[model samples]
Target: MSTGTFVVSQPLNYRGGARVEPADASGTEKAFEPATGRVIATFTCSGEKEVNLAVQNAKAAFKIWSQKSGMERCRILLEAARIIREREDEIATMECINNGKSIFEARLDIDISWQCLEYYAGLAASMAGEHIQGGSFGYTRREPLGVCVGIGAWNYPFQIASWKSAPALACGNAMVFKPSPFTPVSALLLAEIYSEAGVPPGLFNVVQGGAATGQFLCQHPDVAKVSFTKSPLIIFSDCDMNNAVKGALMANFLTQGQVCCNGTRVFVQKEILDKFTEEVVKQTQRIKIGDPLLEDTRMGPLINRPHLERVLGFVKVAKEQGAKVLCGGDIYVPEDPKLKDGYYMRPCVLTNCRDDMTCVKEEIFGPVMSILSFDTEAEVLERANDTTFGLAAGVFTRDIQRAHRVVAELQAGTCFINNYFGRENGRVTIEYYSQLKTVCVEMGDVESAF
Candidate 1:
């Protein structure tokens, strides 16, 4: 998918629809090509002052952009979609190098981002205030929140950036975006496309840095709202073996298991642990681990060396606490000479794990899948709900009644039955992009109203 050329390395910063080097006081952060362990570029690190400037510009842009007709917004977004499609291969290749995901998966992310924009554009065109007939005429209007901030994770850099920007702009709100420092290039490129698509200067901005940058954006008074998504899978004894295997592999290895809501914890019924462990181990060993740009490569490197060590450290902690490493808990070195320097690890499977184990209790954010045994529905349900994070969960069962019961009892925001990842069509984002307000008018004079 490469074009034999690349967007030149530059300080990644955008404000008021133009690229600028970040304020020098905060210094620069180095970005790497994860698949090659090469320094791709350095981004100007943004600090509190830069954050304030971006937010101030966003608030100013919101005043004018919010008043534009929905049709105008839709037209502009559609153009952005077209530009994205045109540059699909280039963008995908960039992300593959920048984030260490296979080119195929990166292409899929680009496709998803385009569809999200298109869906939001349609929403913008058809949006209408609701009218009610009662004692007095009244209506409900859905209006954009003012300036907003979209904080993106490293796992899906391009997709997350577009996911936040498309809906926020469609609803007539401006945004200041902060991509994870590990993978900021794709987002910076996205800002360029948005500007070319006719979004006014300051409507969408990208500031590059680490935690301090994110903290400033979160605490800023001008930011009206923030949006995020993440999840786990539960398997019952009665579930089909094939379904369990497929769901487990896809959930744990997709994005090299860097997903926030990845099905990392497997609460398998005791009867199937041995059988499931064998199958998963065989499957994990077969996964193609090599260069990300290749179509056949299924898994690539972790984001960088430190992140690699972090994942391996979790595996060490799991083993120390008496969890058995049934499959893999070691670094993977590919036969390809080019890939040797990259940060790659085998997909790990741990059995005989306790609920109190660090690997099970904490978010490993890696390709480590820790499987624990459970005997009863009630027992497993209690264990699954023990964590503070209730983002998403999956229930694999054939019985419709059991599925309903489990879904109702579980505390996750989303639950899937007989499936791992839920079907995503980009429609659910309306909640994050706009606010509902009621408008009312008295039908008669105030004096006559008693």
Candidate 2:
């Protein structure tokens, strides 16, 4: 059985001459219509052999690529940005078709990817060695970390890959991206597009596969870094299971609870739990869910049926564990006759979740939010920092003092106050195209310099 959120008749990518070949090493993984659970595309779950090939290719390319000045790298990447912007419509539509995102949202993701690359390209020339005033005339330069493997999630494949690969490349590294087995099409196409846009053959490459491929990529000695986006549960297990000692550089987790880090698990004071849940439900209900290809759909279906089921699994566990379903507990089996065959679930909000409950403590990783309340700022701060995963979190309050206090107490890489997505986009109202960067500092090596 299968259901589709949107009508997508063709394969994930529109391949060109010398089309991408399927993996010779393994069984095929099916890409299904998430709305209906019908099979949409089938791709081989690539293996280590392919990972080795890709990494070796990247390593070989890196030798030559790293020698080029940052200016040269920028030339190639900036051209890539221009090409991506030029083909924005096609690229955006392609993401929607592959990922079940509304075209508007897809376009936004694509635009962000383009902008990230462009930003890094311009900044590449600036990623220079820094000087130390008091020290022994010390200076530090950012060097490419050899071959990096980017493991992107399905929810935003193009965007995540761009985020991981752009900075790595801007600093002169080569990458072998292993796209989500569930949504490999867009990433695969992106690899080809980069090549077509004049990026060197091995500078950026794609290998579509499943668990085995990822393990191989992580375990490979030549691989210097692994940029990944998966649940902490999976990441922790894989890290141990693979005995992944080498190439296990810094792993940047993007998908923790659900798409977009789940906003660090919402925390509310005890007296306001009821009001908070109610407001969250009201806002969630207002979110327009429909065809991602459309310009207006705010929320879209999961990558496929298995993915939808996986999300529901968390919801099911929450109910079984006695968590209260404040609103949107049921799946919406399409009201329209034409769209009845797809697998679609309404946005869910779980309440009465205690700090100790699995749902509240762990990531739901769906469109579900399991909120818990606390009595005092001190108590809630402890609750928010309860989990081992300390990626990111958010808050909503009008009190300036409270904001400052919480900001200092909340343990996260970044904090958000009275907002989501942060000043990255909105702050740029005054500055047109604001972007992000990753900084690196060196130590002992600088002493040798005059």
Candidate 3:
């Protein structure tokens, strides 16, 4: 159960049609097993030469891939989705091993990934532009932006890759993906699946490396566009006590609280402050922190040692201040000796937190929850929006009018009401991978224009 059946632990650079050794295998980065404090895999770092080649090759392949009819593109993507469905278990296990997320969560990621492909498959043939009537009868066309690069973060590894790839490919752009150095294996498998689904040789390539490798892909003149994803949220006064409690749990503990938009600053109305804090703390204590591969485990270790220390340090600093530690603010030593050295932490909850506290002000990723109290909607709204970062935000309330008014005032790119979908939507998503151009011609000849 520990070992994965999908891709090889140690992977290579996949370019054009097959996996090949890097042109310059620059550095050595070891991928970790958070459950056992051991090196599970090593990276084959591709240097500038390989990054350039991958982008150029993708650009070349885009010529053919972009010209394919949208119907053909739809068929191929859905086929890739089918392959993902058949290989779901193995792929989920591979992610479970690589990311230290539970088998249950990893399976969910795979399911969403394949469904993303399925949805995009239908959308593939559905892109359109508008027509304007004038003397020239001008029209607008939505065209794919040649070669695209995807820089996937470690948290959702294969899911982010699939999310980026599906829309870009659906709109007819070829991709050169750079998975997070820590979780590279499953991405290689994705490239293989796409190749099998009949994407052109370099239509979807995976070049493995660290930051510099990604820089190469982004800086390459031949590359058309680059894609990257990055977040946090709030709780409110007069919020539905039960549903709000559920919302807080998911916001902080989902993905072990490593999520970008985990509402670390849970602002409860003063009326329900004590009750909300008690139940939230109760539920947090019951969170099962154990071997990620175990069926019963609900939370896993942070990605590695440095990360564990940094997150735990946030807890230490918060305690040093006047913030109250309600529950769970220390490293968890597992009973299984093998997991003894793993980078694990008990999920922490702090109450009586101020807006100025380090944890509250900074956008942090971990399972740490900082609960603050607010007397009025205006006070909390100002407090939540007081940041340079605003990727996402949430508000929980039973009052429909209050919900509408509060959400309107919150400063965020996306707003969640009662629930957090945490995904971008509509045709706008696919449209991001494309560019629009307007063309006008005088059918009546140049003389008519004068």
Q: Model 2 residue 449 lDDT?
A: 60
Q: Can you write out model 3's per-residue Cα lDDT over 228-339, one digit (the tens) per residue?
A: 7723445665666778887888888877788776676777888888888898888889989888777888888788888888888888998888888877778899888888
How far does residue 242 in candidate 1 sit from its true spot (Å)? 1.4
TM-score, cand. 1 vs. native: 0.90
What does candidate 1's lDDT look like per residue over 356-431, in tens digits?
8889878888899988889999899888886444577888888899988988888887677888812244335765
Better of 1 and 2 by lDDT: 1
Count clashes in each candidate, considering only residues at least 3 apart in sequence or on different chains. 3, 21, 3
- TM-score winner among the candidates? 3
List the candidates ranked by TM-score, beginning with the highest: 3, 1, 2
TM-score of every model versus the real structure: 0.90, 0.77, 0.93
lDDT at residue 399 of model 1 (Cα atoms): 88
Model 3 alpha-carbon drift over 4 Å, by segment: 3-10, 134-136, 230-237, 387-389, 421-426, 437-441, 448-450
Q: Rank the candidates by lDDT, best first.
A: 1, 3, 2
